[PDB]
Amino acid sequence: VAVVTGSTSGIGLGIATALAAQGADIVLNGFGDAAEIEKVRAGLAAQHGVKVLYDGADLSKGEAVRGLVDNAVRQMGRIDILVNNAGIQHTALIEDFPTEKWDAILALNLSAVFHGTAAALPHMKKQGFGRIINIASAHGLVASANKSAYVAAKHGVVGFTKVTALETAGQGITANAICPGWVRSPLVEKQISALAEKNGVDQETAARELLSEKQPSLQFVTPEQLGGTAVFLASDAAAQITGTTVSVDGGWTAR
Amino acid sequence: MLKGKVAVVTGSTSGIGLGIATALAAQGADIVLNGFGDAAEIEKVRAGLAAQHGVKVLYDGADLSKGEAVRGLVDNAVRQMGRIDILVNNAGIQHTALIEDFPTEKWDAILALNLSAVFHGTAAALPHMKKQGFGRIINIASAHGLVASANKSAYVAAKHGVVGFTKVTALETAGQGITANAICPGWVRSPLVEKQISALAEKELLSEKQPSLQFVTPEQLGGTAVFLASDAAAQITGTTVSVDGGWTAR
Amino acid sequence: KVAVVTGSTSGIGLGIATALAAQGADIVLNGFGLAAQHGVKVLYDGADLSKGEAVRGLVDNAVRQMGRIDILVNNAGIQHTALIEDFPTEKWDAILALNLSAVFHGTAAALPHMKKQGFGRIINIASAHGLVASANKSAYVAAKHGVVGFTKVTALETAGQGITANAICPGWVRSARELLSEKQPSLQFVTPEQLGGTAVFLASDAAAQITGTTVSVDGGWTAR
Amino acid sequence: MLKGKVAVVTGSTSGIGLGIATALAAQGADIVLNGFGDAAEIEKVRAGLAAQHGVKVLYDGADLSKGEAVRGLVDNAVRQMGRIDILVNNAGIQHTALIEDFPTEKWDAILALNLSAVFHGTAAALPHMKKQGFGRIINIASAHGLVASANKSAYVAAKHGVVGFTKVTALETAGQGITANAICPGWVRSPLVEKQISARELLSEKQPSLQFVTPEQLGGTAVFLASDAAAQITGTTVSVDGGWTAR
Ligand SMILES: NC(=O)c1ccc[n+]([C@@H]2O[C@H](COP(=O)([O-])OP(=O)(O)OC[C@H]3O[C@@H](n4cnc5c(N)ncnc54)[C@H](O)[C@@H]3O)[C@@H](O)[C@H]2O)c1
Ligand SMILES: NC(=O)c1ccc[n+]([C@@H]2O[C@H](COP(=O)([O-])OP(=O)(O)OC[C@H]3O[C@@H](n4cnc5c(N)ncnc54)[C@H](O)[C@@H]3O)[C@@H](O)[C@H]2O)c1
Ligand SMILES: NC(=O)c1ccc[n+]([C@@H]2O[C@H](COP(=O)([O-])OP(=O)(O)OC[C@H]3O[C@@H](n4cnc5c(N)ncnc54)[C@H](O)[C@@H]3O)[C@@H](O)[C@H]2O)c1
Ligand SMILES: [Mg+2]
Ligand SMILES: [Mg+2]
């Protein structure tokens, strides 16, 4: 049983899918269109021989996050994997950064990770097994201007991830944080557009520029690729891979 | 020297912050103190530094857990001192427990002061520093902003958050005469640590984290802050300066 | 696929050689049964990598005997403990010769073909000592940090050409529990198998965009 | 200040090294310069620093590409100046080229100077510093000791090794009144970079501040590291890169 937050879109959907395909029962979560979401839940459950549940908890609130985990154990019988992926973005200079936006990014991008982890650990320890996979970002290791809340939160996730690993040292549980580079999800398309209109160029020229500025390989990372990474971390080969970061950024953090 | 400059140091009524405010005052910087404790002892410290170093020293008891109070502290510093060259975001609290036993109220509190206050203070200071063409933002993080320790999930997450926030601050101000850096201390024997010293007694703990087996002093951190505030550090920005007796090398 | 695991005669290199076998890759052993147990062309080249010529050779020696080169695993390396002042200049150059220079030679001989093919997976076996240090191991830690940095440059030089380069930084393996207690929080050694799977994973097409980085398999070593 | 202390600065006949030796001299420390160049030009610099700062200044043209010469520089320093409090391993060289087009000659050269010299120089100084109860090894690494660039494999490789070596040096000396740290600078407009400028937009790619780092600033940094306020700063890197590594 694997619970993946914000798994109704982009990266989360990729990791949810890739885990289903490994025989794990999935608990979807996130927003968007209800009809399309049910179509995703049913599809995955019938495309792979596994139980797929949907819990639309709003992770911007601790209780709701812990609630998602307790109810996930109550309806699935157990929780093996917790992929804390749900996240949002907002760009502006520090002095123009709305407090409300700062609060929202910290509550979802960082605090949800704490609440989910805190509710999951008790079940994982008692069962002698556990896999906590936090979706941080290259921005959990380096920074970019105008993304203070995001960079702070992502760095927070990396830090919290390490603590989780140390508290669970050898108990059959491991906590890690994938740190993706650009992934052309809706979260990045909004920026591509912003860049496209900023320099009066077309949607595809801005995409290439935004990509070359940070990504050496000049190629976007994929949810499927990220799913493959999440699956590996879930594997037995990664039994001793804990409290670390795994960068899938095509050279972003190398230079 | 820092004559003619104004430094605001949060949580400077004691510990690390007091050593930093003192070191800066000894360089001729005007100072704005902040923090809690005994009001009489705070006034003695405030008047004492002003007299000993011949600088102007004000006190502002803003409760840093409140965003608007943090921004108010910076703005009133500018209104009363005339400018703000150095912002030292040092105030912070701790709490130990397993992630599962970690009180939510404790999580929110650590984050609000240890991380959010750095944001609020920095946001308030930036506009003034950009206009001034000069600026030095010094965030007191910790070795825990680079590595972790069990039972300190909130603290480590916040500290790491500060490190990241510092890098973003540096990038948004790069080339404008402003730098942003995070000093990351190792063990420093102050009230925040003597409390953990006594705790372990009911059950020389440097061997664990600090390879040199020596404590870092408020004075040494004050000297590091004075260095980052100097002109030789004009191109030192968006980075961490570890003062941890080897903590992070191994 | 064709993978050249150096120092794969024993320990970690063996584990990596083994795992790449199970995935259907033609192993090109090295160092000082599997061909049948896995159904692959397993060769042996005892070329001593402590010589840039031997290394640059061991590579091309596979481009002709295997006809192809897809995966290069620079694993071979030695260790010597001694204070910096008491550290033999002989050993220093030895540790740097193999542990670091061999990677640059092997990599220098591999890239030309990988770029031609349009596919490559350079996997260097560094160490936690490529990110952190320990007293009395100045040559190892230095070389390892060196590998780490070299790995990053190899990645930037091959970014977007279908070739990646990463560094696995293993923690305590087995080639006592008080030794673990001090560096490994999990208190459980890392196995060549796990390293094999990791190397396997890094070779996966899922790690296509994973380049110029390090994968710490240390049971928590670097986390604290 | 640094009155009574002796500081050896490798490759200090010009550029960064000279700026560091000059800042240390200004604090009152006796200086041992090292490097190549014109005999009269070097003497002018040597005699000038000594006269201007009121300290003793020796010049040793030892070739640091040789392990014994490097160790000889240090012993000669202790022989002439009577002690060694500060060692700044700064001499270095550069060569750009693809890993495949990279001359093995250049690879081993860059490694012996940029990396082995730090080792040799440090081994020679430690016995003296441990006996003294005080020491400061200041290695001049680079932003490339933490991150990398294309076509500088040997350079990046060497710098990272220095960074790692610095950490071991610190652990092996922890608590003995000795610290070892590595300054990692970004672009400094000197010959090492002027040869690449030919081969305000060169900064634009790596240095956010769009301003070069100066030898004076690196010297001020070496001075801070040698001060007592830095007694507990050891085994770490100090980046002076205008934001290079922040992003
Ligand atoms: N796209 C990138 O370039 C990229 C790469 C590095 C890391 N990241 C991280 O990847 C993760 C996934 O983002 P993505 O790029 O797939 O974006 P996305 O918008 O496509 O997906 C975000 C998901 O979060 C869910 N979500 C938002 N608010 C929520 C709330 N309050 N409660 C519950 N669910 C909520 C959404 O419904 C959605 O399914 C985020 O944590 C993001 O910061 C993004
Ligand atoms: N003590 C150590 O060993 C150590 C290790 C490295 C990093 N740190 C960091 O150093 C900083 C200083 O801590 P310290 O060790 O001097 O502890 P301390 O408790 O002695 O000092 C904390 C200061 O914060 C002020 N403060 C607390 N809450 C406040 C609020 N809401 N509003 C305004 N002021 C408030 C206090 O009045 C006090 O002056 C903290 O950010 C801490 O996390 C400390
Ligand atoms: N300038 C930069 O942009 C930059 C970037 C960060 C790091 N670095 C590092 O700074 C240090 C100094 O570089 P610089 O820019 O001042 O260059 P430089 O060439 O101006 O100075 C190098 C000095 O080293 C001496 N030297 C060269 N080979 C020697 C040998 N074999 N033995 C003894 N001395 C020798 C020279 O005589 C010269 O005085 C190097 O270690 C370099 O890697 C420089
Ligand atoms: Mg460590
Ligand atoms: Mg970088």
Write out the two tokens for B228: 């980052």
Closest approach atom of ligand 3 to CA D12? 39
The CA-atom distances, in angstroms, between C26 and each of C1, C49, C76, C120, C200 are 6, 20, 19, 15, 13
Those residues with Cβ within 8 angstroms of residue A236's Cβ, 6 or more apart along the chain or in another chain: C194, C197
Question: Which residue do the tokens 């399309």 mark?
Answer: A36
Q: Is A150 a catalytic residue?
A: yes
Instruction: Please give the helix or strand (H or E) that residue C201 lies within, else none.
Output: helix C192-203
Q: Quick check: D17 and D88 in contact, CB under 8 A?
A: yes
Which amino acid is it at A128? Answer: G
Write out the two tokens for B64: 């840093």
Q: Quick check: D230 and D179 in contact, CB under 8 A?
A: yes
**Which DSSP letter does residue C189 get?**
P
How far apart are the C-alpha atoms of C9 and C15, rounded to whole Å? Answer: 10
Gyration radius of chain C's alpha carbons = 17
Question: Which residue do the tokens 């050689």 mark?
Answer: C17
Q: Quick check: C102 and C147 in contact, CB under 8 A?
A: no
C-chain CB neighbours of B250 within 8 Å are 132-135
Asked whether the beta carbons of residue A160 and residue B164 sit closer than 8 angstroms, the reply is no
Q: Quick check: A131 and A165 in contact, CB under 8 A?
A: no
Residue B62: CB atoms within 10 A of its CB come to 22
How far apart are the C-alpha atoms of D170 and D175, rounded to whole Å? Answer: 9
The alpha-carbon gap from C7 to the nearest alpha carbon of chain B, in Å, equals: 27
| CA C83 to centroid of ligand 5, rounded, Å | 33
Instruction: Please give the helix or strand (H or E) that residue C215 lies within, else none.
Output: strand C213-217
Spot the catalytic one: A2, A17, A18, A150: A150
Chain breaks in chain B (C to N over 2.5 A) after: 203
How far apart are the C-alpha atoms of B91 and B120, rounded to whole Å? Answer: 13
Mutate to test the pocket of ligand 1, among A11, A27, A37, A108 (most ligand atoms within 8 A of CB): A11
How far apart are the C-alpha atoms of D53 and D49, rounded to whole Å? Answer: 6
Q: Quick check: D101 and D73 in contact, CB under 8 A?
A: no
Q: Quick check: D185 and D88 in contact, CB under 8 A?
A: no
Write out the two tokens for B73: 């502290």
Gyration radius of chain B's alpha carbons = 17
The CA-atom distances, in angstroms, between D4 and each of D83, D84, D129 are 10, 10, 14
Spot the catalytic one: B155, B165, B187, B247: B155
The CA-atom distances, in angstroms, between B131 and each of A11, B135, C121 are 42, 10, 51
Q: Which long-range contacts (CB under 8 A, 24 or more apart) does B103-106 make?
A: B104/A62, B104/A115, B106/B154
Burial zone of C101 (CB within 10 Å; 0-12 exposed, 13-18 middle, 19+ buried): buried
> Distance between alpha carbon C122 and the CA centroid of its chain, in Å?
8
User: What is the side-by-side strand order in the sheet with B239-243?
Assistant: B57-59, B30-33, B6-9, B86-89, B135-140, B178-185, B239-243
Q: Quick check: A140 and A177 in contact, CB under 8 A?
A: yes
**How, if at all, do strands C26-30 and C2-5 pair?**
parallel
How far apart are the C-alpha atoms of A5 and C20, rounded to whole Å? Answer: 34
How far apart are the C-alpha atoms of C85 and D121, rounded to whole Å? Answer: 10
A-chain residue closest to B152, CA distance: A163
Asked whether the beta carbons of residue C87 and residue D161 sit closer than 8 angstroms, the reply is no
How far apart are the C-alpha atoms of C190 and C195, rounded to whole Å? Answer: 8
Instruction: Please give the helix or strand (H or E) that residue B1 lies within, else none.
Output: none
Closest listed residue to residue C135, CA positions, set B243, B250, D133, D179: B250
Q: Which long-range contacts (CB under 8 A, 24 or more apart) does C77-81 make?
A: C77/C7, C77/C102, C77/C125, C77/C140, C77/C143, C79/C137, C79/C140, C80/C139, C80/C140, C81/C136, C81/C137
Per DSSP, helices labelled H in chain B are 15-25, 39-53, 67-81, 104-111, 117-132, 153-173, 191-201, 206-209, 218-229
| CA D223 to centroid of ligand 4, rounded, Å | 27
B-chain CB neighbours of D242 within 8 Å are 174-175, 235, 237
**Which DSSP letter does residue C206 get?**
G
Write out the two tokens for B44: 């003695």
How far apart are the C-alpha atoms of C48 and C123, rounded to whole Å? Answer: 19
Closest listed residue to residue A95, CA positions, set B128, B15, D9, B192: B128
> What are the pocket residues of ligand 3 if the criterion is a CB atom closer than 6 Å to any ligand atom?
D 10-11, 13-17, 34-37, 63-65, 90-93, 113, 140, 142, 185, 187-188, 190-193
User: What is the side-by-side strand order in the sheet with C2-5?
Assistant: C43-45, C26-30, C2-5, C71-74, C120-125, C163-170, C213-217
**Which DSSP letter does residue C97 get?**
I
How far apart are the C-alpha atoms of D159 and D220, rounded to whole Å? Answer: 21
How far apart are the C-alpha atoms of B134 and C202, rounded to whole Å? Answer: 47
Asked whether the beta carbons of residue B167 and residue A143 sit closer than 8 angstroms, the reply is yes
Per DSSP, helices labelled H in C11-157 are 11-22, 34-37, 52-65, 89-95, 103-117, 138-157
Closest listed residue to residue A158, CA positions, set A142, A146, A170, A182: A142
The alpha-carbon gap from C106 to the nearest alpha carbon of chain D, in Å, equals: 10
The CA-atom distances, in angstroms, between C37 and each of C19, C24, C41 are 12, 11, 11
Ligand 2 in reach of B165 Cβ (< 6 A)? no
Write out the two tokens for D159: 């710098």
Mutate to test the pocket of ligand 2, among B10, B14, B16 (most ligand atoms within 8 A of CB): B16
DSSP states of chain A: -EEETTTTSHHHHHHHHHHHTTT--EEE---S-HHHHHHHHHHHHHHTTS-EEE----TTSHHHHHHHHHHHHHHHS---EEEE---------GGG--HHHHHHHHIIIIIHHHHHHHHHHHHHHHTT-EEEEEE--GGGTS--TT-HHHHHHHHHHHHHHHHHHHHTTTTTEEEEEEEE--B-SHHHHHHHHHHHHHTT--HHHHHHHHHHHH-TT-S-B-HHHHHHHHHHHHSSTTTT--S-EEEESTTGGG-
> Distance between alpha carbon C214 and the CA centroid of its chain, in Å?
12
D:72-131 residues touching chain C, CB 8 A cutoff:
98-100, 102, 104, 107-108, 111, 115-116, 119-120, 122-124, 126-127
How far apart are the C-alpha atoms of A3 and A27, rounded to whole Å? Answer: 5
Gyration radius of chain D's alpha carbons = 17
For residue C195, report the phi and psi dihedrals to the nearest 5 degrees. Answer: -60, -35
Quick check: C134 contacting B, CB < 8 Å?
A: yes
The CA-atom distances, in angstroms, between D200 and each of B25, C108, D189, D197 are 38, 34, 11, 10
Closest approach atom of ligand 2 to CA B187? 3
The alpha-carbon gap from A27 to the nearest alpha carbon of chain B, in Å, equals: 22
Q: Quick check: A68 and A29 in contact, CB under 8 A?
A: yes
**3-class SS at B213?**
coil
Q: What is the dihedral of CA C204, C207, C212, C214, to 10 degrees?
A: -80
How far apart are the C-alpha atoms of C36 and D2, rounded to whole Å? Answer: 70
Instruction: Please give the helix or strand (H or E) that residue B86 lies within, else none.
Output: strand B86-89
The alpha-carbon gap from D6 to the nearest alpha carbon of chain C, in Å, equals: 20
How far apart are the C-alpha atoms of B82 and B78, rounded to whole Å? Answer: 5
Buried b (16+ CB within 10 A) or exposed e, A208-244: eebbeebbbbebbbbbebbbbbbbbbbbebbbbbbbb
Residue B95: CB atoms within 10 A of its CB come to 16
Question: Which residue do the tokens 């003034």 mark?
Answer: B128
Write out the two tokens for D209: 């501040």
How far apart are the C-alpha atoms of C108 and C126, rounded to whole Å? Answer: 18
Burial zone of C48 (CB within 10 Å; 0-12 exposed, 13-18 middle, 19+ buried): middle
How far apart are the C-alpha atoms of A227 and A24, rounded to whole Å? Answer: 13
Q: Quick check: B5 and B86 in contact, CB under 8 A?
A: yes
Best of C164, C210, C217, C218 to disrupt the A interface by mutation (most A CBs within 10 Å)? C210
Residue B97: CB atoms within 10 A of its CB come to 15
Residue B20: CB atoms within 10 A of its CB come to 31
Q: Quick check: B96 and B152 in contact, CB under 8 A?
A: yes
Residue A61: CB atoms within 10 A of its CB come to 15
Write out the two tokens for B171: 């990038």
How far apart are the C-alpha atoms of A176 and A185, rounded to whole Å? Answer: 22
How far apart are the C-alpha atoms of D225 and D220, rounded to whole Å? Answer: 9
A-chain CB neighbours of B67 within 8 Å are 99
Write out the two tokens for A22: 């490994």
Domains of chain C: 1-224 (3.40.50.720)
Those residues with Cβ within 8 angstroms of residue C127's Cβ, 6 or more apart along the chain or in another chain: C140, C144, C169, C170
**3-class SS at B210?**
coil
Instruction: Please give the helix or strand (H or E) that residue C193 lies within, else none.
Output: helix C192-203
How far apart are the C-alpha atoms of C138 and A50, rounded to whole Å? Answer: 52
The CA-atom distances, in angstroms, between A103 and each of A83, A89, A152 are 22, 12, 11
> Distance between alpha carbon A184 and the CA centroid of its chain, in Å?
14
**Deposited experimental method:** X-ray
Burial zone of D105 (CB within 10 Å; 0-12 exposed, 13-18 middle, 19+ buried): exposed
Q: Quick check: D74 and D124 in contact, CB under 8 A?
A: yes
Quick check: B147 contacting C, CB < 8 Å?
A: yes
Q: At what angle do helices D39-53 and D15-26 cross, to 10 degrees?
A: 20
Strand partners, B241: B183
The CA-atom distances, in angstroms, between C44 and each of A30, C35, C120 are 53, 11, 21
Three-state SS for chain D is: CCCCCEEEECCCCCHHHHHHHHHHHHCCCEEEEECCCCHHHHHHHHHHHHHHHCCCEEEECCCCCCHHHHHHHHHHHHHHHCCCCEEEECCCCCCCCCCCCCCHHHHHHHHHHHHHHHHHHHHHHHHHHHHHCCEEEEEECCHHHCCCCCCCHHHHHHHHHHHHHHHHHHHHHCCCCEEEEEEEECCECCHHHHHHHCCCCCHHHHCCCCCCECHHHHHHHHHHHHCHHHCCCCCCEEEECCCHHHC
Resolution in A: 2.3
B-chain CB neighbours of A62 within 8 Å are 104
Who surrounds ion ligand 5 at CB < 5 A? A 142; D 147
